[PDB]
RNA sequence: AGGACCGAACCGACUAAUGUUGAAAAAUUAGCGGAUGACUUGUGGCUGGGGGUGAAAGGCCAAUCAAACCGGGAGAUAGCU
RNA sequence: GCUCGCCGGAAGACCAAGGGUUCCUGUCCAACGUUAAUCGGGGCAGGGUGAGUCGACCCCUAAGGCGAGGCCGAAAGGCGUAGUCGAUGGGAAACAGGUUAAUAUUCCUGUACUUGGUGUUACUGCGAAGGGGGGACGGAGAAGGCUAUGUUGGCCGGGCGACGGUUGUCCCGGUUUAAGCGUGUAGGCUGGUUUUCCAGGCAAAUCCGGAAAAUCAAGGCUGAGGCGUGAUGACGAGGCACUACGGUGCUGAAGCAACAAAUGCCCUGCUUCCAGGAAAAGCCUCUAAGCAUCAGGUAACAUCAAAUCGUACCCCAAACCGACACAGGUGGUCAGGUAGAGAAUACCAAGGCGCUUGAGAGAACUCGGGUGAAGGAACUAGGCAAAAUGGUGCCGUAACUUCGGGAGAAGGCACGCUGAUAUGUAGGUGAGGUCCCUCGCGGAUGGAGCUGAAAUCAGUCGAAGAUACCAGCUGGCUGCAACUGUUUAUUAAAAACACAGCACUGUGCAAACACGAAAGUGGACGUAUACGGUGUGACGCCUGCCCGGUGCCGGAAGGUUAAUU
């Protein structure tokens, strides 16, 4: 649910908090656990490759099936928990054998559901199948690209994958963005969307709250000197230029995708 | 007022030490130098 | 055992001060410059060997050299070690 | 509960006076701001000079920064003193 | 030596860093010390640092570094796998008393603890480069139980006061004891057991995980403190006797109770919140290959071992960083009394100091303060500076508002001491005793003793009772920025930067983009509710017209057009 805050001081009055209380209150499975320092936008040879990340809380990695490649063992849904590394829900599952994993928490899914992965699972969200196996006009997530290679596309809270057309050994995909895209047949899907729709409807009220995420404050190019950043300069608020990145491409409209290898499978643009 | 030199030992060892010279062919030629100059310490490190 | 080598050469010479008379007036302990490099064991069994004295423990130290000066010249004595061996009280030494 | 309130430690630096061959190559005194947080601090580590880092002042990078320091080209050149 | 003054959350004591003999003794005053110097962190000589338990070393890892092969690179080299290093973190064990001129948890006494190796005996399935558990973890909040410690009473020793009184409700001092062992409490966590089966833990496993049965319903884990012991001991006010006048030897009374109480312990606990909170080893358990009436394991005992380096001294400073014996800077620990909410502040304790030039005089003028007739901002660029306000409880408080605020708005009353209510109250703590039960650190009752606010009434002193220190000036209109924050170290703190929010645009994952001759790495172990760039800057109402110019996006009929041929 989204609850707004009360202004008892300037930084509550905007904040929009998502609280559900279906969600594991106590610790995350230990023996699923791995530690990830930060890196804070510093590549191999300590330089910042990417700008404004940095600080934040301290977080452990959940690791997540993805890939699902457990076909014919049915699995109960122990209890949904935080996760810290992504922006949607994950559930931790119980199969008949007594095996313990992660998979991403659809929408609908609550404790004590049942999930199955293969080629005779029954169509129901949480289960994966080839898409081959799954109706034309379905809504799937977790889609993967290359057969046991993992899911890839729909990944987001909230986001999904219609099934458009079946033809041949491939099938077309409407992604999220809005392209149609074409995968293989093979490669497997999970029914149903992305829980934690409402991730998105969140505020953060006040700038120590993004701080608390890891992003570090964005400074325009306008507001400094030409000797670093081709915005710079001028006696007051002066522009007079065409913007641009600050290594000087043109950042408003010009199109940088340059793949010839993939531009096989885009069956139209996201326009 | 807090001045530049603040002392650790274990940091000056790392760092002009004798074999953080030898670990690279620039120290290794910083110590052919002071050889030749004929210096009585060619290093911190002591 | 320790060769005859190390238990002739560990021990160098007795230590005389007003601590070592206290020391071996009333805690039966002899202190002797010994090899800077002379373990308690060595110390102990050289004792033994080479007086004929029976030897409770060892206790050890490195005396460090101070630095002094022979008329602007910079000089600094040499780093030796100290024994506080203890007998078991029939001795005498 | 709170980038909540008052207020020591702690972190800073708005005003005035003194000092200006200073007790001090940036301080002292009386007031002043924050003081559970975008806080502060210890230890160790990483980013190197047309490069780094910068909540952006051309700021900082060992009292030096519109291009650090050291050595070399080098006795650069100087229609100037 | 006697007085006086200063600090006392430090100007006292102890660790770490850093320094290295500055520590103690004898000797000396040439130079050094901003003066003199018999003095000294100065000169010379000698002495001083004792560890199985403290730290290092050692075992284990973080960030990161190096990196066999490997990939890439004119050369030099770069990145990185297996590995190997890397603490600021995880891992065994000692306390109290005494002793030096200078060391002590290291020496001596007393009493302990840990790990490892061997040998004897007894019983016996041992075994890893592998599996599982554990180690093992956040912020805030609250309560309960304790302890350090303090106060008072009791007890013991001493005293009867230079000036009126002081055999008493008087004065002064002491009233201390650890680790370890036993007990296992206040308290927190969790159902226990025994069979049977199993797509899981790379193979296996009796171990973990899953499933199904019966059975008992209290077992297990943790845990401050208290109590007995340790301890018929040590220490202990003093006293006696010497003296080389610093001190030294012998002997030694009481050594209880009540109340108060931590920011410390139980507590890695409990509750709650989102921003969702290291790793690995030591440790426990399982087994594989292997060995199988030998090894190996367990248990008791005995013996042996625990090596090497550091330990002096300063350590908010005259010894470290600042060229100085420099109003500077420097991480952590300890934390008494009265008043006080307080680690503020005032005065004190333990403890440490009077800051390495003084002596006179009492001009102008400068600096730091006190007071001031009448006036009260007339000063000045400007109330700059100064003056003023200042606590607690209670009454009371406007416009405006995003309904939280504004607000401590404004403004006002009371406040000391004494007695009574009440030989000290409401309340807190709580013994003896009565009874009961899972028998003990137990439960109900009981109220002695101790402790103890706030209020009302009456009285009373001074000019003044929040009397000192300490401790908001208030109100009205208006520009700018929503706000908390950040910035020109060293003349600019702001209206500048950032900000939550908004918009445009790019990006389908081997993503865009960035660092890189490259390999690779970040983005991200993320996947369009995501990431990057740009502009604007909460919120409310809104954001109108122009595509001619420049840019960008799409198109490709025609014109022109490179290498090539
Ligand atoms: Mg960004
Ligand atoms: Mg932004
Ligand atoms: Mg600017
Ligand atoms: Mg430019
Ligand atoms: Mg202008
Ligand atoms: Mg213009
Ligand atoms: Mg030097
Ligand atoms: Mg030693
Ligand atoms: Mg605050
Ligand atoms: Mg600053
Ligand atoms: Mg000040
Ligand atoms: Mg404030
Ligand atoms: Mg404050
Ligand atoms: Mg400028
Ligand atoms: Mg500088
Ligand atoms: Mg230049
Ligand atoms: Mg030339
Ligand atoms: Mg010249
Ligand atoms: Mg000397
Ligand atoms: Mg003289
Ligand atoms: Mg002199
Ligand atoms: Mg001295
Ligand atoms: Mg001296
Ligand atoms: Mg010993
Ligand atoms: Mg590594
Ligand atoms: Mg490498
Ligand atoms: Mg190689
Ligand atoms: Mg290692
Ligand atoms: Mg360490
Ligand atoms: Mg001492
Ligand atoms: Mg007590
Ligand atoms: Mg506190
Ligand atoms: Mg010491
Ligand atoms: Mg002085
Ligand atoms: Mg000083
Ligand atoms: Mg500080
Ligand atoms: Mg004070
Ligand atoms: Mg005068
Ligand atoms: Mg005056
Ligand atoms: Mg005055
Ligand atoms: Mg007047
Ligand atoms: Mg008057
Ligand atoms: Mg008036
Ligand atoms: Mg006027
Ligand atoms: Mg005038
Ligand atoms: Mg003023
Ligand atoms: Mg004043
Ligand atoms: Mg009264
Ligand atoms: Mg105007
Ligand atoms: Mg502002
Ligand atoms: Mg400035
Ligand atoms: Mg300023
Ligand atoms: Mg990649």
């Given at each position: 649910?989204?609850?707004?805050?009360?202004?008892?001081?300037?930084?509550?009055?905007?904040?929009?908090?998502?609280?559900?209380?279906?969600?594991?209150?106590?610790?995350?499975?230990?023996?699923?656990?791995?530690?990830?320092?930060?890196?804070?936008?510093?590549?191999?040879?300590?330089?910042?490759?990417?700008?404004?990340?940095?600080?934040?809380?301290?977080?452990?990695?959940?690791?997540?099936?993805?890939?699902?490649?457990?076909?014919?063992?049915?699995?109960?849904?122990?209890?949904?928990?935080?996760?810290?590394?992504?922006?949607?829900?994950?559930?931790?599952?119980?199969?008949?054998?007594?095996?313990?994993?992660?998979?991403?928490?659809?929408?609908?899914?609550?404790?004590?559901?049942?999930?199955?992965?293969?080629?005779?699972?029954?169509?129901?969200?949480?289960?994966?199948?080839?898409?081959?196996?799954?109706?034309?006009?379905?809504?799937?997530?977790?889609?993967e690209m290359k057969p046991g290679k993992g899911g890839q596309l729909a990944r987001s809270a909230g986001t999904y994958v219609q099934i458009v057309a079946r033809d041949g050994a491939y099938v077309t995909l409407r992604l999220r963005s809005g392209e149609m895209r074409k995968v293989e047949a093979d490669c497997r899907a999970t029914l149903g969307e992305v829980g934690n729709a409402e991730?998105?409807?969140?505020?953060?009220?006040?700038?120590?709250?993004?701080?608390?995420?890891?992003?570090?404050?964005?400074?325009?190019?306008?507001?400094?000197?030409?000797?670093?950043?081709?915005?710079?300069?001028?006696?007051?608020?002066?522009?007079?230029?065409?913007?641009?990145?600050?290594?000087?491409?043109?950042?408003?409209?010009?199109?940088?995708?340059?793949?010839?290898?993939?531009?096989?499978?885009?069956?139209?643009?996201?326009? | 007022?807090?001045?530049?030199?603040?002392?650790?030992?274990?940091?000056?060892?790392?760092?002009?030490?004798?074999?953080?010279?030898?670990?690279?062919?620039?120290?290794?030629?910083?110590?052919?130098?002071?050889?030749?100059?004929?210096?009585?310490?060619?290093?911190?490190?002591? | 055992?320790?060769?005859?080598?190390?238990?002739?050469?560990?021990?160098?010479?007795?230590?005389?001060?007003?601590?070592?008379?206290?020391?071996?007036?009333?805690?039966?302990?002899?202190?002797?410059?010994?090899?800077?490099?002379?373990?308690?064991?060595?110390?102990?069994?050289?004792?033994?060997?080479?007086?004929?004295?029976?030897?409770?423990?060892?206790?050890?130290?490195?005396?460090?050299?101070?630095?002094?000066?022979?008329?602007?010249?910079?000089?600094?004595?040499?780093?030796?070690?100290?024994?506080?061996?203890?007998?078991?009280?029939?001795?005498?030494?």
């Amino acid at each position: 649910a989204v609850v707004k805050c009360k202004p008892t001081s300037p930084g509550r009055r905007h904040v929009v908090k998502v609280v559900n209380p279906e969600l594991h209150k106590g610790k995350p499975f230990a023996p699923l656990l791995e530690k990830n320092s930060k890196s804070g936008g510093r590549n191999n040879n300590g330089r910042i490759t990417t700008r404004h990340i940095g600080g934040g809380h301290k977080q452990a990695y959940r690791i997540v099936d993805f890939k699902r490649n457990k076909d014919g063992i049915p699995a109960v849904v122990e209890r949904l928990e935080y996760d810290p590394n992504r922006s949607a829900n994950i559930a931790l599952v119980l199969y008949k054998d007594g095996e313990r994993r992660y998979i991403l928490a659809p929408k609908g899914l609550k404790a004590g559901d049942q999930i199955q992965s293969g080629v005779d699972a029954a169509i129901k969200p949480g289960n994966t199948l080839p898409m081959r196996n799954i109706p034309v006009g379905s809504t799937v997530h977790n889609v993967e690209m290359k057969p046991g290679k993992g899911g890839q596309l729909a990944r987001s809270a909230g986001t999904y994958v219609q099934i458009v057309a079946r033809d041949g050994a491939y099938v077309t995909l409407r992604l999220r963005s809005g392209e149609m895209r074409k995968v293989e047949a093979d490669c497997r899907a999970t029914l149903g969307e992305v829980g934690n729709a409402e991730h998105m409807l969140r505020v953060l009220g006040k700038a120590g709250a993004a701080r608390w995420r890891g992003v570090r404050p964005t400074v325009r190019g306008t507001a400094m000197n030409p000797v670093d950043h081709p915005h710079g300069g001028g006696e007051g608020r002066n522009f007079g230029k065409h913007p641009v990145t600050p290594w000087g491409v043109q950042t408003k409209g010009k199109k940088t995708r340059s793949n010839k290898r993939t531009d096989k499978f885009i069956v139209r643009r996201r326009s | 007022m807090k001045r530049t030199f603040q002392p650790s030992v274990l940091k000056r060892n790392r760092s002009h030490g004798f074999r953080a010279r030898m670990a690279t062919k620039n120290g290794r030629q910083v110590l052919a130098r002071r050889r030749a100059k004929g210096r009585a310490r060619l290093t911190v490190s002591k | 055992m320790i060769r005859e080598e190390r238990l002739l050469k560990v021990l160098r010479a007795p230590h005389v001060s007003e601590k070592a008379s206290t020391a071996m007036e009333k805690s039966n302990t002899i202190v002797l410059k010994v090899a800077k490099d002379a373990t308690k064991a060595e110390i102990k069994a050289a004792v033994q060997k080479l007086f004929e004295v029976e030897v409770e423990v060892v206790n050890t130290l490195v005396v460090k050299g101070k630095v002094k000066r022979h008329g602007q010249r910079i000089g600094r004595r040499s780093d030796w070690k100290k024994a506080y061996v203890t007998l078991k009280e029939g001795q005498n030494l």
